[PDB]
């Protein structure tokens, strides 16, 4: 899912 | 000259492009830290991570971008990644370079355990952007244009992305006619560089193989954004 990038884009 | 809404949008992109910097801790290391292939490389990794940090935060602010489908947001981010980094890098190397710094960085880059076949085209491209003494808003717009390719792999809705990139292209074109009114090919000269920038997607993909010898296991962010192993 790419959790790290989702995490950064939704911050 | 520039539409009332076009300027509404150009202000919006500047307020995100100029928000971000390369940190003190990191630019000091270019002077501070000791020299060798291990430490020089270890520095370049930190910069590259910083660019992804900055890339991402820029991207999320691009107007419209939140309306895009989540999978397509990812795809864009990873597709544009390498190009955005070569472009940030150039303009860190051409403009935010107290001259002593940029020379030391050149030394450090050239003794990083990386090979000429990659180092030389990088510096080529720097010098090439060098002429066209590009402006603050030229880099911000190109970056936004680079990030919003409908061209990248794995995008579902290219139409939605195209409609985000086109306002920006217009703004740039209309910008060249204002800060470079004597030179009406300028806008083309720019996208000419934007072409030789895509050359680097092969360079990068190669260069991962070469250097993956000696087992680094880059930081989690570079790992995920470049998609390695
Ligand atoms: C320079 C701006 O772009 C990058 O930041 C970058 C990219 C897009 N790709 C790679 C594979 C690296 C790298 O450090 O190689 C292991 C770094 C990298 C860091 C320093 C020097 C060089 Cl040639 C590269 Cl390719």
In SS3 terms, chain B reads as CCCHHHHHHHHHHHHHHCCCCCCHHHHHHHHCCCCCHHHHHHHHHHHHHHHHHHHHHHHHHCCCHHHCCHHHHHHHHHHHHHHHHHHHHCCCCCCCCCHHHHHHHHHHHHCCCCCHHHHHHHHHHHHHHHCCCCCHHHHHHHHHHHHCCCCCCCCCCHHHHHHHHHHHHHHHHHHHHHHCCCCCCHHHHHHHHHHHHHCHHHHHHHHHHHHHHHHCCCCHHHHHHHCCC
Q: Which one of A4, A9, A11 has the shortest CB-CB distance to B73?
A: A9
Ligand 1 atom nearest the C-alpha of B51 is: 5
Locate the domains of chain B by residue range: 1-229
Distance, in Å, from the CA atom of B52 to the CA atom of B85, rounded to the nearest integer, reads 7
CA of B48 to the centre of ligand 1 (A): 7
CA distance A9 to chain B (A): 6
CA of B18 to the centre of ligand 1 (A): 23
Method: X-ray
Residues of chain B positioned with their CB less than 8 A from the CB of A5: 56, 74, 77-78, 224-225
Level-2 CATH architecture, domain B1-229 = Orthogonal Bundle (1.10)
Residue of B79, B224, B226, B228 to mutate for A, most A C-beta atoms under 10 A: B224
């Amino acid at each position: 899912n790419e959790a790290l990038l989702r995490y950064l884009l939704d911050k | 000259e520039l539409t009332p809404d076009q300027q509404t949008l150009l202000h919006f992109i500047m307020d995100s492009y100029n928000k971000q910097r390369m940190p003190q801790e990191i630019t000091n290391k270019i002077l501070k830290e000791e020299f060798s292939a291990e430490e020089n490389f270890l520095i370049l990794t930190e910069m590259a991570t910083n660019h992804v940090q900055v890339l991402v935060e820029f991207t999320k602010k691009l107007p419209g971008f939140q309306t895009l489908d989540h999978e397509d947001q990812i795809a864009l981010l990873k597709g544009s990644a390498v190009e955005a980094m070569f472009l940030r890098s150039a303009e860190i190397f051409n403009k935010k370079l107290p001259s002593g710094h940029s020379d030391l960085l050149e030394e450090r880059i050239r003794n990083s355990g990386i090979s000429d076949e990659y180092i030389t085209p990088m510096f080529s491209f720097y010098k090439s952007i060098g002429e066209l003494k590009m402006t603050q808003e030229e880099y911000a717009l190109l970056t936004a244009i680079v990030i919003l390719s409908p061209d990248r792999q794995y995008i579902k809705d290219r139409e939605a992305v195209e409609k985000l990139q086109e306002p920006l292209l217009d703004v740039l074109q209309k910008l060249c006619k204002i800060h470079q009114p004597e030179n009406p090919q300028h806008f083309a000269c720019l996208l000419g560089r934007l072409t030789e920038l895509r050359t680097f997607n092969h360079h990068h993909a190669e260069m991962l193989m070469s250097w993956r010898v000696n087992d680094h296991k880059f930081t989690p962010l570079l790992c995920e954004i470049w998609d390695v192993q």
